[PDB]
From a paper:
In summary, we report the high-resolution structure of pembrolizumab Fv in complex with the human PD-1 extracellular domain, which enables us to identify the detailed intermolecular interface between pembrolizumab and PD-1. The resulting co-crystals appeared in the space group P212121, and the structure was determined by molecular replacement to a resolution of 2.15 Å (Rwork and Rfree values of 18.4% and 22.6%, respectively). Although each asymmetric unit of the crystals contains four complex assemblies, analytical gel filtration confirmed that the 1:1 complex (approximately 42 kDa) exists as a monomer in solution (data not shown). The N-linked glycosylated residues Asn49, Asn58, Asn74 and Asn116 are located away from the interface, suggesting that the sugar chains have no direct contact with pembrolizumab. Nevertheless, one important novelty of our study is the visualization of 15 water-mediated hydrogen bonds at the binding interface (green lines). Pembrolizumab forms a large, flat paratope to accommodate a large conformational epitope on PD-1. However, in the presence of a sufficient amount of pembrolizumab, the PD-L1 binding site on PD-1 would be blocked, and thus, PD-1 would not be able to undergo dimerization. Therefore, the PD-1 signalling would not be performed. Instead, the structural data reported here is a useful resource for the rational design of middle-sized molecules such as cyclic peptides or DNA and RNA aptamers that may possibly more easily mimic the effect of the binding of pembrolizumab to PD-1.
When the PD-1 (also known as CD279) inhibitory receptor binds its endogenous ligand, PD-L1 (CD274, B7-H1), the resulting signalling suppresses immune responses against autoantigens and plays an important role in the maintenance of peripheral immune tolerance. The PD-1/PD-L1 interaction inhibits T-lymphocyte proliferation, release of cytokines, and cytotoxicity, resulting in exhaustion of tumour-specific T cells. The blockage of the PD-1/PD-L1 pathway results in the reversal of the exhausted T-cell phenotype and the normalization of the anti-tumour response, providing a rationale for cancer immunotherapy. Two antibodies against PD-1, pembrolizumab (Keytruda, Merck and Co.) and nivolumab (Opdivo, Bristol-Myers Squibb), were approved by the U.S. Food and Drug Administration (FDA) in 2014 for patients with advanced melanoma.
Author numbering:
A (entry chain C): 31 to 146
B (entry chain A): 1 to 111
C (entry chain B): 1 to 120
């Protein structure tokens, strides 16, 4: 049994050019589970920005969307480096159980508004 | 660039025998407890079929007599009891980094 | 339910170009990245490239970086591979294969293959 990850904060406000750091919390991270960092697409679907561990075969991967595992074992920083106005949107994270019939659980969605 | 080396090149086996196939990577393909190594089956002239993903997970719909094991640079595909439909070429593939490469294949033949 | 049906056999001359299609059906077309891998006579399997159908992002094997163009159409759920300046070593069977966008859990479905022959 496992619980879905949590995404913080619910509303993040950053100035254009600064880094915008969310936090995905998930305590099952292991060889059984993987993490995803999503932003909602124009089709109202979750568009995968990044993953933990790094999805190196994702076509068009942008290293500007950075995921870092924190020492406490539960938290993961998910940062937009050098954030632009067009980076404003709705963000979330997911946890995927890899065992056959991989199951996905999403966090609640947070809002990033890039200003100035 | 990671090179995958499969041994043996050919296994001549009868139905009911157990097949074990080796895939050795020139560099490690495991990090954080995940092994980025998949096993496919291809019969000649037909499309490949995913058998094992992440080196130990059985793809849904694939019979349980197939299993994967290993980590780092050493990996094995086991067919616990060979059936007639299992005579085919078997390939490993890594995704630790780019470019993605495949092994040379191991042909499981009927003797 | 899940299918990937590729275009038909191609017979080309050196220097020509070929465009192979891959019609996907039975699933959310943007939930899976699409990849292209070929298998030549006397050669093994060779990864050519990949495309993210949601944003059009691509990755490539450096051997094909400047000769392959990958595109997608979500309104028809079709992936396209265009290979220009064909040479003799391009004779092969060309496959499209999908991968879960969430994580790499293998190429869990392959197209049937498209034979491309380069001959004089």
């Amino acid at each position: 049994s496992w619980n879905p990850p949590t995404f913080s904060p619910a509303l993040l406000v950053v100035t254009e050019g600064d880094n915008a750091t969310f936090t995905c919390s998930f305590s099952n991270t292991s060889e059984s589970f993987v993490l995803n960092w999503y932003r909602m697409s124009p089709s109202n679907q979750t568009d995968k920005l990044a993953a933990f561990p790094e999805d190196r075969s994702q076509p068009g991967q942008d290293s500007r969307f950075r995921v870092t595992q924190l020492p406490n074992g539960r938290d993961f920083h998910m940062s937009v480096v050098r954030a632009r106005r067009n980076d404003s949107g709705t963000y979330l994270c997911g946890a995927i159980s890899l065992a056959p019939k991989a199951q996905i659980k999403e966090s609640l969605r947070a809002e990033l508004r890039v200003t100035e | 660039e990671i090179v995958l080396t499969q041994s043996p090149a050919t296994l001549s086996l009868s139905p009911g025998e157990r097949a074990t196939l080796s895939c050795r990577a020139s560099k490690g393909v495991s990090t954080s407890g995940y092994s980025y190594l998949h096993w496919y089956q291809q019969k000649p002239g037909q499309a490949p079929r995913l058998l094992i993903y992440l080196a130990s997970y059985l793809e849904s719909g694939v019979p349980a007599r197939f299993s994967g094991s290993g980590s780092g640079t050493d990996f094995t595909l086991t067919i616990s009891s060979l059936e007639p439909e299992d005579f085919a070429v078997y390939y490993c593939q890594h995704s630790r980094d780019l470019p993605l490469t495949f092994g040379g294949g191991t042909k499981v033949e009927i003797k | 339910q899940v299918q990937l049906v590729q275009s038909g056999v191609e017979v080309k001359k050196p220097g020509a170009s070929v465009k192979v299609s891959c019609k996907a059906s039975g699933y959310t077309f943007t939930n899976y990245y699409m990849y292209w891998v070929r298998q030549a006579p006397g050669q093994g399997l060779e990864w050519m490239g990949g495309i993210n159908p949601s944003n059009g992002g691509t990755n490539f094997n450096e051997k094909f970086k400047n000769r392959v163009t990958l595109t997608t159409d979500s309104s028809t759920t079709t992936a396209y591979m265009e290979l220009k300046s064909l040479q003799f070593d391009d004779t092969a069977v060309y496959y499209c294969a999908r991968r879960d966008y969430r994580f790499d859990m293998g190429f869990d479905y392959w197209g049937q293959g498209t034979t491309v022959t380069v001959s004089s």
